[PDB]
Design a binder for this molecule. Sequence first.
Ligand SMILES: *[C@H]1[C@H]([NH3+])[C@H](CO)[C@@H](O)[C@H](O)[C@@H]1O
Ligand SMILES: *[C@H]1[C@H]([NH3+])[C@H](CO)[C@@H](O)[C@H](O)[C@@H]1O
Ligand SMILES: *[C@H]1[C@H]([NH3+])[C@H](CO)[C@@H](O)[C@H](O)[C@@H]1O
Ligand SMILES: [Cl-]
Ligand SMILES: [Cl-]
Ligand SMILES: [Cl-]
Lengths: 651, 655, 651
Amino acid sequence: AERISKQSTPFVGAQIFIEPGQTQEQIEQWFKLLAESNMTTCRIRMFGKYMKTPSGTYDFTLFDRAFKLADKYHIKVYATLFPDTEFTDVGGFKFPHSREHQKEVEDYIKNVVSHFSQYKNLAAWVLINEPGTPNLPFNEPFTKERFSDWKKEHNFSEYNEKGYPVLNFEKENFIIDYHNWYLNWLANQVRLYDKQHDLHVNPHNVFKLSGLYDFPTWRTFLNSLGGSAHASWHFGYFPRKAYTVAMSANAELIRSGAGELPWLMTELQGGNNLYSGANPLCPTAEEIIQWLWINFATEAKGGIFWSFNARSTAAEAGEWAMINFKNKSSDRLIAAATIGKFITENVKMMSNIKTLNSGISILYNHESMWVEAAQTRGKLNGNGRSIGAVMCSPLSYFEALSETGLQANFKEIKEFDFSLNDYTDQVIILSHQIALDNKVIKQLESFVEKGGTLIADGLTGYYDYQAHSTVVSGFALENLFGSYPIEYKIKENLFSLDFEKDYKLPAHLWKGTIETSKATPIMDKEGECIACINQYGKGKVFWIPSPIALGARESKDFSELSKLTVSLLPNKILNDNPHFDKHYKDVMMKSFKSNGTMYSLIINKSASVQTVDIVGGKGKAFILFANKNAHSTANKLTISPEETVIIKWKN
Amino acid sequence: LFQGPAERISKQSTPFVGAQIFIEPGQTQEQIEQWFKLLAESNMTTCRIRMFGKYMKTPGTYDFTLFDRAFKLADKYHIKVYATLFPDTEFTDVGGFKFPHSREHQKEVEDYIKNVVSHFSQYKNLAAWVLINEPGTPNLPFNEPFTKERFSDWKKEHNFSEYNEKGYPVLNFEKENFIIDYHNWYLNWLANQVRLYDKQHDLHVNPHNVFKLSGLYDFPTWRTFLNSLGGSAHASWHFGYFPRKAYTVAMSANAELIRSGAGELPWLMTELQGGNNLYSGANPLCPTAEEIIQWLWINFATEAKGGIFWSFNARSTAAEAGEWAMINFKNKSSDRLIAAATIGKFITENVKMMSNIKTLNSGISILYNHESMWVEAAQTRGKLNGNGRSIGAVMCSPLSYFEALSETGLQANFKEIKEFDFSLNDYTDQVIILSHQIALDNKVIKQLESFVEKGGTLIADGLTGYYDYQAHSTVVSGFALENLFGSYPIEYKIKENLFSLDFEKDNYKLPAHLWKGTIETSKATPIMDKEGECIACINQYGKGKVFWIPSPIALGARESKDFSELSKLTVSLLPNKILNDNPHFDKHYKDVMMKSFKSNGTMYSLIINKSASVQTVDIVGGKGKAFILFANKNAHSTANKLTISPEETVIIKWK
Amino acid sequence: ERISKQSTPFVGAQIFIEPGQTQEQIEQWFKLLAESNMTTCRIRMFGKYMKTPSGTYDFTLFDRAFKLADKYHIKVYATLFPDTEFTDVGGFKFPHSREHQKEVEDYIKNVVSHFSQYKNLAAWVLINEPGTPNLPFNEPFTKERFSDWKKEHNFSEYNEKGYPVLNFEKENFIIDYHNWYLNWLANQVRLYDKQHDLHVNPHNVFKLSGLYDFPTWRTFLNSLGGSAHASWHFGYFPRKAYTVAMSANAELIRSGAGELPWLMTELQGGNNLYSGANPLCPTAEEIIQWLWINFATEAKGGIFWSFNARSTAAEAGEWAMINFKNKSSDRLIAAATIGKFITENVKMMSNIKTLNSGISILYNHESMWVEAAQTRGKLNGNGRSIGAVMCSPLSYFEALSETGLQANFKEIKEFDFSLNDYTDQVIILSHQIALDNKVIKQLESFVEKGGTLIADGLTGYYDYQAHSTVVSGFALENLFGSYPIEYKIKENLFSLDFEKDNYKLPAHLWKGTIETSKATPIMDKEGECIACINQYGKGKVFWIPSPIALGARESKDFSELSKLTVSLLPNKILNDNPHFDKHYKDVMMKSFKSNGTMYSLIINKSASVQTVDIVGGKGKAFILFANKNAHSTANKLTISPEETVIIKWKN
Ligand SMILES: *[C@H]1[C@H]([NH3+])[C@H](CO)[C@@H](O)[C@H](O)[C@@H]1O
Ligand SMILES: *[C@H]1[C@H]([NH3+])[C@H](CO)[C@@H](O)[C@H](O)[C@@H]1O
Ligand SMILES: *[C@H]1[C@H]([NH3+])[C@H](CO)[C@@H](O)[C@H](O)[C@@H]1O
Ligand SMILES: [Cl-]
Ligand SMILES: [Cl-]
Ligand SMILES: [Cl-]
């Protein structure tokens, strides 16, 4: 069996939806067109329901038929373990209902892995479709008992070391461990019967569910990390014109979770929402090209569209499909096929992509999300006093950097390597990460001391991991920030921070004021201290405790956040990295390397032709890919609305 | 002419204006008599009385005194009585329970019916038993043991497979099919209970909120045990899909829907809004005098044998205290009772005309089906965002065609598909509109094929035929309507709530809602858009034609608040016979309606102006010269050009 | 000291005591509290922070605070707060069970026996914020109480005339239950301490007044308190009208107090981060506005929640008057100027008596209870929603404030109907939809003896059993000399245009038409009778059954309601009371006396400097207090935006 690696040739693929009632002739027609569309790979939901016989035997006929047709057309198969469940359960159950249900899942895995492991075109086992749920079944006896046991095996005090009352977030910490346990158990079950094939899983809705996911632990039992990134389900924090930024951030978040493992996008939106989806659309041909290039530029080893063909009955009947109702190519399949073709014509380049890390890392942590949920009491008013602000804030910095043509990592804090001796020319952005503990503050102190630049806005560091505010009891970040908070004063959803001898930064909801000791104060036109720069060892801290990233989001203008961030970056980042000479609204660029050669991905999401002046790095623009005849004069790229451009930098 | 001295309602009965007389303890003889006196002097012949079990129960005997007093005063003033069976229930239960709570409760209802029917059947002024007030509820009591057991029994008596004949997974809509049968069962049982003690009087029932609850109602089965079909059509409860200026269209569609359900049975509007919402109602108003006249004429023009207003007098305590009443707090006439009285007077002065009304059927039938509503509910997961991806699109779509036709002065039927007669040999000059009827089975497609083959015109827009009755999409597995449509769907692509379909020829633009459908023609003639995609087709099929446009253009007209393009398109697809034989407008008129009817050979037209300004409407088609028989604001006509004032109702007699 | 109507008013603040705080921080709070001219603190006596493992009480944490309060001559309001979940911010309102009642008995024994011994104990607060909309009917203690209460009451389903009735068993039980538990808490405290003032702080009074029988509470209290938080309680008002909100809240508590002194136990001292329904940070200007409105309305104190902040989870670092360095915000500096003013004007400030104009705006429990039943709990902010029966009188109150006229705001049972003369007294019953025969007789007596009655909206539509006499035989026909004909629903906003071409009154939702017998009809331009004046004995009735107060609210314009009301007032009120020569949008004035000397409080909440012409009473304006250099020429006051002015009337 071929094992996926960081050197694998990336593929374009699609879900092949198999259910009873389909004919041999239609299934073969799908695989034939899939092969002719320069797609190498399919994914198949191995429905327990469509293998169970009245007598309790497994009948594999329906899936044998699909596997054999895949083999005939040289299509490899991601096989999703999907035990028997209600027809109306679109996504699948996330945990066993009971010990008896766990034994049924054991029996399902034994039967399905023993049989289908024998196919030479099996590429991977997907352990579970879309692990993680917002609504965890605490009512079910399996989960209820696990939670009880877990609580008794942990020693939690109602008071901290200094004697203050604490929250311990038992539920949230259990949920991490519970996901870790069940996925690890699924991996172990598959490994009883098959030690040959890649294990894969697709975390989903990552801007909401990242607080469920311990990706470092998952690396211990996976061969690749996947992802669902559906424009109609997962990008609600963005307008459609910014699904570029959404896909880029989703790619960076999975990339970070993957660490040393290769990653691929297991599930992308391939077609139309009729009745399904939260933010329904039909992806344009242009969007299909944009999403594949963003993922490959971000080291994805694959892009699998849900779906090639449609479900026939009830939920998503005739929805999501890349083929039309005559089983011929939509403009979406035609577009995906040009990327498959491009890969086969540029194998060495496409097989060795490494994202050009600017040195900027935007960090989020589970605990800021958990404290936000407790403090907002689950309010959904889309603002700082609602669930989502601790993710929308870093996503806004990410967007501002994208509109500057700068790559940024998007990482959980435990995925950042704090063990290096030098962080010269490395930048951490902590945007409204409202919960930081002593351990992480010490890591941040080390990082800055050794040359790191730390940018902190919003209520970053207001609470610890027990929702205790050191801002009240004795500020844990006083040392690093060389300053102390004075007040937060709530304002409108959108106000202006007007710096002395003007920046006018858009700010959201709260004005923070500080007192500097070691730091240099920055004053506003009202004579209040609203920010500071602390020189700490070899590094610097910029602290502005008003939410200026959420301000940029609220004002729908990232230009001031771009200019401010650029002015704080070490010169080395601006000299070594291709970026825009200025901020461009609704334009993104990210750069990658493949065997020594540097490339740039440019996408224009504005309503008009843009001329983007690319500066930094070395080389002359050669246009390798452009779906609307983009042209460059020196390093000035003229790019049409919705166009995707790959520049190869020659020399 | 054997089972009763009781007058039995017929399609030949003289229509009446009437009102609820609300009877509760605490009222005096003097006030009740004053109500019946004024009711009689307002040219009303009929009242309806809720026979509250609560106000007859003694510390277990029945005391009938409170209702005897009302029946005797009704009799004294020659007022006939619709008596509503309303068993004992909480004072706070405004509308009444819809089903027994338990086997023990069913026995209490049996005892209630025995006592009340045995006693009040003896009054010579009893016109009808209303079996239940407003059968049907959105929120069915599945948690109560009587319903839970009935559902369990019904499930064990039905054999459902999880797969169809081709092997595909299916939904079976057990809940929805049970609910139809459960309503059928309980109403039939109520009819049987009444018939144990009285075989002389008309059985009546008033289905309500029909644009939402039609999926609960099997009117063909109800005909089996009713003598007349009723209806509640309240401007404050039932017309949420319409602005107030289109309550004319709402009432006309509600009348057509009940008319269709009635079939051979006479029908009447059991419950119309007679007065003011204080705290009650979803879309509160006080009907204008003009609105009262509009609603009575729309119903009579649509073959109603009665209009009964809720209410003559008001409830006194809590819910709807001093609300809904046609009389003011001094028990004298509001402008609403004075207006209703002019229609009562008109009827007594034109008995033969008013007793024999038959709606002039244009030949256009707008069809809805239970199953499109049920599949919509499952697919939209009960979303209430008032659009294609919400509950109500499958009804708002046909209602939009209906509105477009009303603004063209054309009658259209509004019928459940099982109420349409598919058994005829000729459908020349007949038109079916299937607007966003997303669920169609093989049986109905065969009926539609027969209909078109024999000369029928089929107009289909939106996602009509996307699913079958098991929510299986033949669009995915093998399109069941390919033969009839002479074409095949290619894609739906979601767009904004309002977009334009830009036709390749003639620079022609249709408002469309939410989804753009593209097709491939085989036998049909393709119609292309400016982007070179096929968006519609005309299939010639035997003697008939099919127009198919799988974008929602009716919902597009609704979203744009403009039915003028939908009017022009529909008119251009009608057989010439419909335009030549039927009075209609020479063009589309925004916020004007006309419907025509016949009575013993003579043709009439009803015209209502709901616009802000005086309109001159050019009436064309049929034969005759306009004579203005009824006009509440001095309408005048020159030849067949009618000048009609805002909120005016006009009846033209064609000489 | 025992509090009296002659006590010197104080400024004070909550001192929030929890484990983890140091001696040094607590002392620093009391030191700054003393230096801020604050004499009083309030301390939550958390049962949780006195319970030891063994069930003994350890008082150490509160001893430390009491002793530091004593050292700085700070008196203490001690709040009885039994053991409860850390997450319970406001405290439980009733015992959970008979066993929990015994724990509360033991808590009171231990805490009152111990802390009664401190010489700086000013008051026991029996319970923090009595009243909850949602009573725990599920819990056995409340379930049994309701069962017992129901068996002790005989309710008939019909009235005397035979009509069906509602009896509001739940609402009547809830009044009696609050009466019972507070009385029981008072009796428990009195078992161990007969020396100290008993106090309680009713809250959210514009919503919870239907829970509160203040006349009964007088029997076991020495003072009535109040929570009046801008972020929780003033939802019916924009921020620019929090002056009117505080004035109405002060009047409502003052009325409940009767002969008892009252003080505002809980005012907003600082910032909402995540807490509050209508979040803000009070301005310095707002702090001064609220203290003066309360003192002008006879308050013996203003206690801010809070001096210092909670440290963990709910309201962590929120509400505090001190900043995170434990120094003065502009809010503490502002509060300190009022403390200083009091020490420099002891005799004036100790003897304040509100100058009663003679205008009383009456609300009743029963209008609120019938509204809840008729609106079925709808929250659409209009006549068909919960809150109209309170927003309506609050709108008259606002119109009178913008005329510079004091008005009482009273529950109908708090109005003295037993006098022989009501010459030059005015009652406004605005949309008080429920009136019984007893109250109609009191209103007949009041008008007969010279009273002026103003009734708008659906006043008197129902009786106390939600039976409408408008339908069965109008109970107010005699007093009104007229009969309702119809209500007709209209738009949210329409105009009642009087035929005499004077008044064009904004009206909300319903147009009422009437038939006059004894009364003089007032016709509108459409030829309908919309109002009347009835001469009844020596008094007059103005009846307009359209909601013109809710009309003024909906139009955000109280000017026509002001002019109409002024034209109906007895001459004596206009001659004897300082008021404005005309209506001033977003300006308030209320007047008070201290011994013989008359004063006026003027606040400008408009965006611009106003010149207000004060007329009525006697004297020349001398500016005693002004925080933005107000000046007067004769009796014309020039007052800046957000400025508070006290005028002393010299002669
Ligand atoms: C992912 C995605 N959610 C599809 C479209 O909603 C769904 O049908 C499948 O269950 C995939 O897991
Ligand atoms: C019909 C209608 N719902 C009336 C107004 O709400 C009501 O009083 C009656 O109970 C009928 O339900
Ligand atoms: C009063 C007020 N509700 C405070 C602020 O929300 C709260 O912390 C206190 O518990 C008091 O209830
Ligand atoms: Cl899958
Ligand atoms: Cl009835
Ligand atoms: Cl307290």
